[PDB]
Design an enzyme around this catalytic site. Structure first.
Site, PDB file in Angstrom:
ATOM      1  N   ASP A 164      21.119   1.533   0.026  1.00 29.62           N
ATOM      2  CA  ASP A 164      20.312   0.785   0.986  1.00 29.62           C
ATOM      3  C   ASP A 164      18.862   1.215   0.790  1.00 29.62           C
ATOM      4  O   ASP A 164      18.452   2.274   1.274  1.00 29.62           O
ATOM      5  CB  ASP A 164      20.805   1.039   2.405  1.00 29.62           C
ATOM      6  N   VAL A 165      18.104   0.405   0.062  1.00 28.62           N
ATOM      7  CA  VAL A 165      16.714   0.702  -0.256  1.00 28.62           C
ATOM      8  C   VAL A 165      15.827   0.049   0.797  1.00 28.62           C
ATOM      9  O   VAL A 165      15.838  -1.174   0.955  1.00 28.62           O
ATOM     10  CB  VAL A 165      16.350   0.194  -1.662  1.00 28.62           C
ATOM     11  N   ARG A 166      15.061   0.854   1.514  1.00 27.61           N
ATOM     12  CA  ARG A 166      14.040   0.367   2.428  1.00 27.61           C
ATOM     13  C   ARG A 166      12.672   0.621   1.809  1.00 27.61           C
ATOM     14  O   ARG A 166      12.558   1.189   0.725  1.00 27.61           O
ATOM     15  CB  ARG A 166      14.162   1.033   3.797  1.00 27.61           C
ATOM     16  N   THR A 171      10.245   2.704   2.528  1.00 23.09           N
ATOM     17  CA  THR A 171       9.811   4.090   2.376  1.00 23.09           C
ATOM     18  C   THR A 171      10.919   5.048   1.969  1.00 23.09           C
ATOM     19  O   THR A 171      10.635   6.039   1.302  1.00 23.09           O
ATOM     20  CB  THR A 171       9.188   4.602   3.686  1.00 23.09           C
ATOM     21  N   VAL A 218      18.734   5.190   1.439  1.00 28.38           N
ATOM     22  CA  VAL A 218      19.959   5.885   1.803  1.00 28.38           C
ATOM     23  C   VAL A 218      21.019   5.544   0.767  1.00 28.38           C
ATOM     24  O   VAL A 218      21.180   4.382   0.389  1.00 28.38           O
ATOM     25  CB  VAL A 218      20.416   5.512   3.225  1.00 28.38           C
ATOM     26  N   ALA A 246      17.495  -8.466   4.050  1.00 28.65           N
ATOM     27  CA  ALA A 246      18.916  -8.170   3.910  1.00 28.65           C
ATOM     28  C   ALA A 246      19.352  -7.053   4.850  1.00 28.65           C
ATOM     29  O   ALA A 246      20.492  -7.056   5.324  1.00 28.65           O
ATOM     30  CB  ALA A 246      19.234  -7.803   2.462  1.00 28.65           C
ATOM     31  N   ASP A 247      18.469  -6.093   5.129  1.00 35.10           N
ATOM     32  CA  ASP A 247      18.821  -5.008   6.040  1.00 35.10           C
ATOM     33  C   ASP A 247      19.153  -5.537   7.432  1.00 35.10           C
ATOM     34  O   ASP A 247      20.145  -5.119   8.043  1.00 35.10           O
ATOM     35  CB  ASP A 247      17.683  -3.985   6.103  1.00 35.10           C
ATOM     36  N   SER A 268      10.906   2.446   8.674  1.00 29.37           N
ATOM     37  CA  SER A 268       9.455   2.397   8.554  1.00 29.37           C
ATOM     38  C   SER A 268       8.874   1.390   9.537  1.00 29.37           C
ATOM     39  O   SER A 268       7.713   1.508   9.937  1.00 29.37           O
ATOM     40  CB  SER A 268       9.049   2.060   7.116  1.00 29.37           C
ATOM     41  N   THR A 293      -4.485  18.201  21.909  1.00 31.23           N
ATOM     42  CA  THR A 293      -4.457  17.008  21.068  1.00 31.23           C
ATOM     43  C   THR A 293      -3.088  16.793  20.427  1.00 31.23           C
ATOM     44  O   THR A 293      -2.589  15.662  20.383  1.00 31.23           O
ATOM     45  CB  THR A 293      -5.536  17.119  19.989  1.00 31.23           C
TER      46      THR A 293
END
Lengths: 261, 30, 384, 261, 261, 254, 261, 261
Positions: F6-8, F10, F13, F110-111, F134, F179
């Site tokens: 499963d390529v996203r 950033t 998996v 597709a995701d 992302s 901060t």
């Protein structure tokens, strides 16, 4: 009045000089950013805005640039918006009375040539010129007015990797002299690095030139002169530099203009 | 060494720690 | 060195078999028992034994040398122990236990005060400005230790100072509530024209003699810095009352507090700066062996604490107490809310030689002493 | 075998040390780039590839990082892929037995602490440690072994503006020693700037420390030691450095591991 | 007239206000980009171009900047080009009559302080101030006027990765309200995400503050006020915000100028 | 074993699943950076290193990518280095048993499709799926298993303006005192509010999804554990939702 | 006078035209950088500086932008600073009299439409328009005046990788015609590549259109017209292009203005 | 087996060749990304992973790089990890049996030299070599086997400004042949530009070389050979190219290795 324009990689100095020869003095000066892709029309707007009513009093222009594209645009701008004023544009490796005793004179930056011409005109002997700009340039001029070359080092800055690692929560460290060379916090450490370290860099380069190069030893009469925007910060910390000349480059441009006129 | 120290101290700790702790109440002073 | 120093300690008191006991009655009977055994009571030292705010209070005689001050403070501990013993000796008398501490862990707080004699000509604004950062930071040296965080201790944890959760204001007059880092009370009991008496209420009661010795000596030397007009304005804190809490609740000694100038410093760093300036002052004057010894002890403690806090576990109160607490936590897999940890914290200060955990650490040689028990016992019955 | 990992901003050193105490020595060493966003699984692939058959011979791991995210991923990696090996991960402000006599010990990077620990362990007297990395870090240790702070300067590099102005036809100037401090072409001038100028920066910082900081004068016994990837280039040009220790940081990691063991 | 300059990271607001105390009102306003490296001379050109004839009628200047270099240049510019006009330049952690109850008051941005000062001046009760800028800043002021801190979230924007993945054949997409929270195409999905999701982000932060922070519950009288460039787009979608004040920061600058006068 | 990739944008998996149909479980999983210009040979090195001796045990592969170039290289890699294993590669707007009732099905990632398919397979009713990547993707599935679209918002990040990034972790309080704390509060609490607001708005405005209806609200993704305690509208967390969706698509195309 | 503004991705052309219908001509022209984030107020400063005293003499404005954000800001600028002058702003897929015979008319850039409208207006027959901008655009107009589509190729430039690898010491390679196609040094090779290769690229596209598309063969009457900043450099090297029209886009803007007036 | 490594600016080709002289043939081949900052250890990992069991069967290595730092690292890698294998590393301006008839032989990239050597060895007559990589390199070799020079053009790509302006919601345009040179939508137009225009670029460069340079006219016998990753896409569109040789660079490396063996 002479309009002098000195474009460097990051900043541009614009000046107005009045008088001639030894009487020439810088009457007005401005500093702006260098924009490598600036067009002639935009630069015209900026220059006219800066000089105001003196636009009608200009008797000449002299310009140099370490950015070739900006020099092209300066030529076009001057021809279009100040067409009745003579202009002298300086290219790298220009013949200005200073011989260039290096492998390829055409590669020598105009800024270095002009600074060395001005230094030798003022002192008329062997000289070492330290220009504090985006880079630190140490040029060497022999007692006969010959450009022997020099060194180019990084400009005065805080460590880039330390600054980039500091992160956006903490804000950027300012360039200033810390209380001690041994910093007790990150800001003091980075400032000690910058100020004291680049003072050591310049002193080391100058001392190495004097120790190595024939004619420049401590027993010879050599003028060490510094110019540039960040020179005032480092001058107290330097030991090898004798003179500070704020308008060295502008005066060199004036000298080139008077020579070519 | 620490084992001996903790043994010696543990032998003198007062009994019923929870109750003894709860019992200690003082009047606020300066 | 010669600055008049006094201390005044209010002891916690209890009768474990008498939940409904009245502390005023118990304190009065303790003081009366001690007075009867000897013979608002003036002891033979010059100290004052009396009852105040439902506590027995012992006020040491004035001393100039901090070592004498610590000796007479320990003498007060012995006086409390003797008083409890005399009370217990009466047949059919409920048992009395006393503690040299400051809190009960439920919300009550009673204080051990320090008194220093300073010049009336010194502006009190200078005192406030120059003494606030030092007072905020000196707990890393003089902290007694406390289990439980917050005024009611509803948050688990160990903190350096018992008094820290009961400090509310930067400057104040009242000692029983809204207590301040600096106390403005002004009664000199002397020529008010030339002498003033500074009153400090932020300190814990201390058992370890090094802790008390540094608490008194370093404070005296810092006051000497103030009177001389040395500049300390660079050390002003942004939010001193917040700083007390932040420092107290970090036994690792790595927490920082923001200065007014934007610097962030640990308490150890502040202590080092003050030590440097005090050492410069002392070296610029005639030799003073006591001041030099205080500076040496202070420097050694600061070095050891920076290296590792447990290297002071036989020197200072809060590292010794924390060594015990961590040992028991490891042995019994406890959490900071465990009642036995609270019991350890409480019984550390029990003034009984055979039951007080500090007294046991001293007996077995697990705690350094700067003075001999002979000096303390002689101080129980003689003036300084 | 001890696996030592030292992640800096730009590069990471991995080392295998065998032996214990004074017998410990670096048997293997590798240098790779630091990827701030590397994941635990990717880093596991890299480490396994580097160490080969010694993976099953590991008896411990010790790691430090100037990039916090990489330290998180290293922890995850070691737990997942070497679960049976004791590990010691080092944070900024770590207590290694070296007192940190600075304002905020938590902002002192683990690399500086470890270098000072190893240097003092070696020399057992006052020392000045110069680490040549993405920054030049000069750290000062007293004769009692206390960390006093120091200075952080830009690392050894050619001028960025000059390199960026060179143009593609001519990136990199191949940092190398030139023939003379007075360059006769642009490449020589930039090399002289970098090499000799940063030699001067280091010598200036060290000399300023010895002149100004109590206990480090020319009359005191001070160990000046240099470590880091670019140190060998500058070592011949330095007058103030007396020692080069290639594996100083790895030895420091070994010392911290043994202390925590 | 008072010239007010509020420099944020991405944009700068210039304003001209006339009148004193409660009668002061913004008569002119401009918005320009913030250029971090702008010089004093360039900025002078821009400011003079913006204000025109009002240059001669200035009676004072007030300025803040979240970018330190620009504040330095603003000081230089105001001293050089408007030397006869009083100026008040604000720094982070400024003392303006609003106590700063945070860890380090010098690290509080001047923009947050000025906004809280103006909000409490207007409402004189417990307030929550939402500034929509390059970041969304939610600041909390007690009923006594003490700044309690707050939250800093990303500014209203479309997803960066989605925009970068779109490809130049379709730069980001317009920030506008879609027809429904359920988008039927990539553009509407991204617009729904931005608009409705950041409305949810703001309402969630405000609601969490009211539920968790003492003195700010639904029972207490709390003024919820919004300001900033993108506030109008989100205001219809918000349920927790009761007031929009377009000129909050400029009125705060006016208050600080008058306080220091 | 099934290899699921499963390529996203950033991160990528990779998973190994064993069993079939309801018996399928994720036995191994890895997370790596996505490099949009990676070549097939480099990716082969990475995948083979990850899976070790299980390379010879693979009985199938399934992959999706939101980066088209990486999908191209994955196809080449699978053809060259695992030529004997069947593979099923997903493209945007694919027919996987879930109708796509949007304007242009071909532009649906597709995701999103795979996640919604998995959600409806698990719950078999109306569902709202929140994927924390992302980007934050909130997708809506009707009671009949139809994909109705959704919303795409920025991923959980600290403000860029507020250079090394600040650590993403829950702060002690919503009101930050420094901060770092302010930025952490803005990121964790603000994005929790963003998700809650989007889900509540869908429930309020979209017919069939009101609070009276039976809707399954499921989250997935790397940063989901961080924000789940602060959410109020999300009922389930499914770590392996995308991988199980890839398994479902593989079994459907088998 | 008509003020015409043509914003492209990298540069914006501003022009002043006087006269109407066939008598309209460009009396003034400027070229500036396109800044995608420019605000309305900054752009007002720039435009006013360019046009000087002609601001008062404007009778209309016509604008187009390939950058939607800049078009938004231009609309705001014209409404605020020239409220009494009619303005006509173009959009992608605009109905200007030229039918758009493509798949999605709304995706056709305004620059292509306006260039095609102007070219057809001039020649009134089948035409191929080659626009040399940040991209090279080759658009096809049928003999009936319909926009058929075209091709979009990279703009004229020296290779990015070669220039990037050239390094900062050698300086950038200017775009100029070399002595020969076979270069004898890196600069000449890169110049030959740029100039002769992009001449070949344009010739190939035009020839392929003529050979493949019905109505444009060598036997048909087709006008091949070029425009753009870099057109003059390549025109001598081209064989398929018959006309150079510097002001084609401005005249197209004028035509759309008069059509909408 | 000979391991051949050809590092280009963007991608590196790795090959295994078996046999000698006319029997040498590429038995294995891989393509990976060039990482200019890769260390020797990381590259060793990648190379060993690629070549697998053949690591132990290597009989020699030949490598070239257009990235000098990578060449340094490759030399180190081979010396450490394959110490028993002879290696030949090319340098720019290498004497490989092809004279370099240019101004400065040392400025000629090793890829150009090796390709020309291989082409002339195959054809033994006048040749034009077109290498499709990050740049399109056209090199000219005389009938006597001398390198005459050539041209360097940008590589095959879609318009960068068009791709950037497309935005993130539309996704990137793939490099593929469209239906027609006249696109009917943005993706088609950009693909037509890329494919057909760069076919025109190559054809124009080759035709201009043949027209202008002596010995290469259409009357002479000239071998026009193409190589490179993107050559197959454009080859159907070219008319001047007669041969495609996928392994030209690897065979050139083999030739240089044998010459130096």
């Amino acid at each position: 009045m002479l309009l002098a324009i000195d474009v460097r990689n990051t900043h541009t100095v614009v000046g107005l000089l009045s008088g001639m020869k030894e009487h020439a003095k810088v009457v007005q000066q401005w500093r702006i950013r260098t924009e490598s892709e600036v067009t002639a029309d935009e630069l015209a707007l900026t220059i006219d805005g800066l000089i105001g009513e003196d636009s009608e009093r200009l008797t000449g222009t002299a310009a140099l640039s370490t950015v070739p594209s900006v020099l092209h645009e300066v030529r076009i701008m001057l021809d279009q918006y100040w067409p009745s004023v003579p202009h002298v544009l300086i290219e790298p490796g220009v013949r200005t009375g200073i011989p260039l005793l290096v492998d390829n004179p055409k590669e020598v930056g105009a800024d270095r040539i002009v600074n060395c011409l001005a230094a030798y005109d003022r002192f008329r002997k062997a000289a070492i010129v330290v220009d504090f700009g985006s880079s630190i340039c140490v040029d060497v001029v022999s007692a006969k007015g010959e450009f022997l070359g020099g060194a180019i080092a990084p400009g005065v800055q805080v460590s880039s990797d330390a600054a980039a690692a500091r992160s956006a929560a903490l804000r950027r460290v300012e360039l200033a002299r810390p209380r001690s060379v041994v910093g007790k916090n990150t800001v003091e450490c980075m400032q000690a690095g910058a100020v004291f370290g680049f003072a050591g860099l310049v002193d080391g380069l100058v001392g190495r030139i004097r120790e190595d190069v024939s004619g420049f030893s401590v027993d010879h009469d050599v003028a060490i002169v510094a110019t540039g925007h960040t020179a005032p910060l480092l001058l107290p910390e330097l030991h090898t530099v004798d003179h500070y000349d704020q308008h060295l480059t502008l005066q060199g441009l004036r000298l080139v203009f008077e020579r070519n006129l | 060494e620490t084992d001996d120290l903790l043994d010696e101290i543990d032998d003198v700790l007062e009994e019923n720690a929870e109750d003894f702790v709860r019992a200690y109440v003082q009047k606020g002073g300066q | 060195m010669q600055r008049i120093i006094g201390t005044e300690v209010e002891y916690g008191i209890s009768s474990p078999s008498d939940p409904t006991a009245n502390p005023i009655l118990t304190s009065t009977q303790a003081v009366l028992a001690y007075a009867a055994a000897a013979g608002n009571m003036i002891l033979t030292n010059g100290a004052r034994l009396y009852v105040d705010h439902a506590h027995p209070e012992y006020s040491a005689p004035e001393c100039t040398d901090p070592m004498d001050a610590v000796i007479w403070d320990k003498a007060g501990e012995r006086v409390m122990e003797a008083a409890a013993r005399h009370v217990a000796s009466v047949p059919g008398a409920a048992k009395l236990q006393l503690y040299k501490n400051n809190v009960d862990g439920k919300g009550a707080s009673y204080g051990s005060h320090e008194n220093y004699l300073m010049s009336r000509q010194t502006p009190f604004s200078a005192v406030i400005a120059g003494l606030t950062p030092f007072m905020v930071s000196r707990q890393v040296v003089t902290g007694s230790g406390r289990v439980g965080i917050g005024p009611s201790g509803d948050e688990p944890g160990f903190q350096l100072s018992q008094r820290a959760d009961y400090i509310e204001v930067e400057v104040g007059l009242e000692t029983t509530l809204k207590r301040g880092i600096i106390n403005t009370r002004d009664e000199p009991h002397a020529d008010a024209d030339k002498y003033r008496r500074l009153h400090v209420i932020i300190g814990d009661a201390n058992l370890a003699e090094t802790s008390t010795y540094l608490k008194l000596g370093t404070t005296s030397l810092v006051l000497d810095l103030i009177e001389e007009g040395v500049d300390l304005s660079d050390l002003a804190l942004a939010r001193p009352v917040h700083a007390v809490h932040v420092i107290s609740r970090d036994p690792s000694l790595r927490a920082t507090v923001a200065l007014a100038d934007g610097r962030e410093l640990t308490a150890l760093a502040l202590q080092r700066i003050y030590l440097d300036r005090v050492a410069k002052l002392v070296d610029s004057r005639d030799p003073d062996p006591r001041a030099s010894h205080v500076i040496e002890t202070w420097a050694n403690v600061l070095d050891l604490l920076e290296r590792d806090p447990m290297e002071c576990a036989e020197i200072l109160d809060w590292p010794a107490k924390l060594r015990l607490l961590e040992g028991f936590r490891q042995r019994e897999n406890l959490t900071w809310q465990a009642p036995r940890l609270h019991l350890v914290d409480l019984q550390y200060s029990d003034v009984r030689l055979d039951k007080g955990l500090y007294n046991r650490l001293v007996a077995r040689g697990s705690m350094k002493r700067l003075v001999t028990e002979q000096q303390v016992l002689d101080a129980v019955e003689n003036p300084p």
